[PDB]
Symmetry: C4
Subunit: 424 residues, 4 copies
């Protein structure tokens, strides 16, 4: 009834997230289309690039430098002669206007640029001039002292004909293309990178799954209304309680409403400005479904046979939070120590990100023989540091390894005490 | 006696699985022959391929494309001139009939194929035409817009002379060979792959181990009859119980009968249609032997000294199943969250398979510094997602890491309570 | 008040270590400048080198040998013709004086060197002669029997112009450069290595963040004085106690004073002789901040709600130390066994360092499938050793894996006993 | 006194194993000399080989095949022209006599060899003829159908001059050299391998560390006599006990005597037939030192403060052994299942060795994301097997992961019961 409505919401959002996962399978075939094309154009425009080169597809020779510039130049020259896909290029100007290239060799470098490190002097008008060469579909050089970044933009149209095997009418992708020689460091290591976007549109010459999605949206709307009614019942009970864990009979419903509104927003409203907002709204729906599973397990406990494990979660977080505070203090201190130490020798130490990176290497064991090994293998320097690195790292290792089972089993015996009360 | 018959079945299936493992050692030398030949023909027919290329042995140049086509063409040309093995090719037609090639350059591509993405149009008779060129042992081109898949089939005969070192008469392998340029994506990334089968037959000019296997089969038949008699005794006891864990005094015997019938079926009956059915029946025999070990440990407990550990398994699954339900709900929710999130950036996220892939990375530590590292290293995009990815992944990490020791030690103290009852 | 002063010290050193982490972010951008340049010159001077070559960028051909010598020779020849950076080279002699090169082809090899292994004889004046060729910015051979080591030194000046994007005036780096062909083994495997240092100086033509750092230093001085006053109070209490854990109300303050003096020394006094002393003093500040977090957690426990977890650490170390002694005895014995065994086959066994390396492979799981796998894969030798290696390694594996949870959960139940006393 | 003699034995074997570790450091520098030379000759004789090639340095082309043969041929031709070491070759015949080569191109292939797989026939006199070409220091072909294995033997002398930096007189190594093209499979994948030994001898023109080792040996002899006296005391106590854990007051002494006799045997007696017997005797000494640490910890417990942890080991093995029997039954069954399953798709499944390989992947986490990942990535076949592989592997994973903490914490609470008795 009313719990039949709740379980209907459970299966209904379950089917809606099944439709989400269906949307995911379809868009995932599509994004496989994306990635196929992505590595594709990487081959395609790419000159001298390699598999795995994304770590280091970067230049030393200026003759190297212009080499790739021309290489892409010819690629734009001769793509229809050469490829295996079917790219199409109509006018499509950017990113600065005027007019349409479609290959725009863009170059930004500073407007005032006197630079003589031999006299130890420089005079820089840090305003940057960008010269662009428009390249009509059927050579010029830049100062290496002068450079900031060099850009090729170009876009190619195609139709995902593989959607016939998905029984669908094919769609039109337009992959926009920014190849970049980049020297923001200005250090000599000119990284090249190809980035791309794509517009998906329907064919020029041209919905039951979409109707089923719309019906799912309407069902989600009815479910959110049911959540609103249940919350009004809970609020009337709260007004009676004021006048007179399990944690989520309200709150999970509110999260579900957030997910449902997110899905509605993803279907239509922000769906005319979709892509990233669609991704984030999927981000919302996931927690909704996670709550869907969780409260499904709560309600489908049916007391779980007396819910001993349900109550087991209860007492410990009362200790576990302060213990969490303490251990996190330990974690942050270890993090500060990393923020100090790793600069002398580390790739795994690179930023506060990499500091977070060390922390999994705490709890997990993947990086220890990696890192604690190889740093001991000593790229190294300044052998007191080589002592001190062992001094730090072995010290970091043992502490949580002992004490964390201490915390978990301490609250374990805490729940053992919660089973000392609770096993009777 | 009767338990001597059971232990005789234990050692008898133990010897039969020793014979299975013997069959495994022999077939494993053989399948090493398979794999040796497999990498072999991969070298052999393969042109431009590499070690490790199986990740990416795929094409960009159409001139690349025909290059490999010709490369294999010459390989079929000149194998006896060139090789280190001894391949033999007699008529052997396929896969479509008429007649015998033995090198069949097969090409499938659609029968109606107007495709112009520049006008945003296409007219496809999705019926596919396949042209095949038969290549008699002692060049033509395909439309790149037009292609679907391109196939070379060829088969080579040889005799595993290395079986003389196994003291056996050598056998005849016929490796059938499908090299394929594949463009089912039609995206430009034409993967090539060589797949092969082989027929093993006896020599044209031509059994005590086979007799010992047959005797093992007869012994397995006697053991299954003993299991049938013991089950009739148990069923008469059940009829007396109706008229009036340890779990497997029947059920393990029934599994053993399944394994024994599977082995009998693998020896003879489906042995005239063997290979995969033989593999699956080995799949059966393994669980039989696993049960063989397990019930061996049960019976050879001899009460295990009072079987405290035997009874230890008893009480906990009563809690552990519902707890398993709960944690699996947690697992499935995390899985849905993966099914959402990873599409923006992941190889480890690729499908529900890869979703299962994340789960070991939960319990194990191999992938954390891998994945939680490198995704943080941010191929990335849309930096709110870069926040949110950390937001998801660190969140996924801690939860089971805490609570799973909670579950295990909660049932641990549960068995501690089962030892609180049971340690006295 | 006085605890407001302590928390002000907590936030004050917190901000000072925030300034440390700020100094770290700034110097880390700089050291990224270092590493960018480092891989740079590695490309730059490097001839025939590769990515990943640092494992094996070493020679076999003498024609190989001179090849790289000339390769660097031309690099010094033609750097301004070729590069992407802006290197500058003024006189700058070294490492022996007289005068200035700036490219010094240095070669050391023994002064008396009769070596005939065919007669099994050698007469070596182990004094070494070093010939050096000074190479003025705009070929000679060495005996391969005769060689000891061959060295190129050269230094290049540049200005880190990328600091304009950090809104700073750019600085002058001078990268000093030692490329070395090294044959101290004299075995034929001539490793080459490029090592570099750099002097950072201000520009020739030329401080509020520095003033804020100085104010932070003065605040640290006031905090150390507050620590000195609190220690005088504690010492007067100790004099009253003599006349009549929590562990760090003194000791953490003393560590903080050490860190504060270290930071003061890093700011000014040893700051005229900085780099490694600066690194070590950062080494000091880290433990200070770690203590900062820890005692922050102590004081901000506020009894932690009765500090059950604080007292939890108390009783166990009384057992844990002797248990630690015992397990470490186990560890050292395993270490001796490694020191024996691995010489026949191991890279992971290389030294007492690598012995420490095995120990993480104990507690962690990263190397097991690596090492216990691949050594079983048997580079190997002397198959009794192949048995014995399994005999050792599987033996090493299980012992701690069982017993260490034994120790941790034994003190776990010890703290369970400490919660048996302490859960009431 | 007498315990001073025992602790003197502890420190004395400690110093003797320090001398063992010293011998290890010295021989390890030497074996580094070995490995340096090993990769050396691998470069040296090796033609077309690569770094990492040891996985796959194997042939396809017969023109490839002879290519390397000649390549080594010229290497023997022109080593003194080319190298960086100092190799010396005097007569040194082998492995068959008559006379001295020193480069012996040896080829074994069967004496009767009619092989026609096209007629499905073969007539093999499995006696093998070996033709050898002696190559005097300053081309012929083999049937590819006919081949079995092809061998080059050659030996080079040199003096480890790097021992002058160890302050020692240098020694004479003679590296004997077997390069082998091997086709025992006869499948076409002719693996090449270079194996080498070396004789270490003193110089032709020519001991306080050796005297200190001899004194250590005499001290070990006195310690073994003390162990014999203590065992005679224990045996007289046993004779009084018959007439009327801690486990190793005898037994550790007996192990120590075994180690001491092993060291004495390694010093002199079998030291005229040393190398592998020396390795094995080091194998003995290690367990001696391990016992040295262990009983050191026993005696230096001094009751360990009441030896609660010493007694903690006591009760549990009484359960742990039968539990170990049970879990090992589980392990063996999983092992049989592997022995079945992996043949269809695995490198990690290769033999009972690799079966042991899976087991660490059980307890450790290194291989899970590796193997359970990549096998799911499906080289694969026969998709019911693809289901069944997941069916097996996920099943293998969870079982020990749950139950093993069950066993450890079950005996943990067992020792908790042993601390329930033992914490009072």
């Amino acid at each position: 009834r009313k719990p039949c409505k709740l379980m209907l919401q459970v299966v209904k959002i379950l089917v809606v997230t099944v439709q989400l996962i269906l949307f995911g399978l379809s868009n995932q075939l599509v994004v496989t289309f994306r990635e196929e094309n992505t590595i594709a154009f990487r081959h395609l425009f790419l000159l001298g690039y390699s598999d795995g080169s994304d770590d280091t597809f970067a230049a030393y020779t200026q003759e190297q430098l212009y080499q790739a510039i021309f290489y892409a130049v010819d690629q734009y020259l001769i793509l229809p002669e050469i490829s295996l896909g079917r790219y199409a290029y109509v006018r499509g100007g950017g990113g600065p206007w005027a007019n349409g290239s479609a290959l725009a060799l863009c170059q930004r470098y500073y407007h005032r640029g006197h630079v003589d490190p031999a006299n130890d002097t420089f005079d820089i008008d840090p305003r940057v001039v960008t010269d662009c060469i428009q390249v009509d579909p059927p050579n010029l050089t830049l100062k290496f002292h002068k450079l900031i970044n060099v850009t090729i933009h170009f876009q190619l149209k195609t139709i995902n004909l593989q959607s016939l095997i998905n029984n669908e009418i094919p769609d039109c992708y337009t992959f926009s293309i920014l190849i970049t020689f980049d020297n923001k460091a200005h250090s000599g290591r000119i990284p090249i990178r190809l980035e791309t976007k794509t517009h998906i549109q329907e064919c020029k010459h041209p919905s039951f799954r979409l109707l089923f999605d719309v019906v799912v949206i309407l069902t989600c709307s009815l479910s959110f209304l049911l959540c609103a009614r249940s919350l009004l019942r809970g609020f009337l009970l709260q007004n009676e309680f004021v006048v007179f864990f399990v944690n989520g009979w309200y709150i999970l419903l509110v999260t579900s409403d957030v997910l449902t509104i997110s899905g509605t927003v993803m279907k239509i409203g922000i769906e005319a400005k979709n892509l990233a907002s669609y991704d984030v709204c999927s981000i919302l729906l996931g927690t909704s479904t996670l709550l869907v599973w969780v409260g499904v397990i709560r309600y489908l406990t049916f007391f779980h046979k007396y819910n001993i494990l349900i109550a087991t979660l209860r007492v410990a977080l009362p200790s576990v939070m302060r213990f969490c505070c303490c251990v996190a203090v330990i974690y942050l201190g270890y993090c500060f120590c990393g923020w100090i130490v790793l600069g002398p020798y580390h790739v795994k130490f690179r930023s506060l990100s990499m500091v977070s990176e060390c922390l999994f290497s705490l709890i997990n064991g993947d990086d220890m023989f990696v890192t604690f090994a190889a740093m001991q293998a000593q790229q190294g320097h300044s052998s007191l540091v080589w002592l001190f690195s062992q001094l730090y790292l072995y010290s970091f290792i043992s502490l949580f390894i002992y004490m964390v089972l201490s915390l978990f089993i301490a609250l374990i015996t805490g729940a053992y005490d919660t089973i000392k009360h609770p096993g009777g």
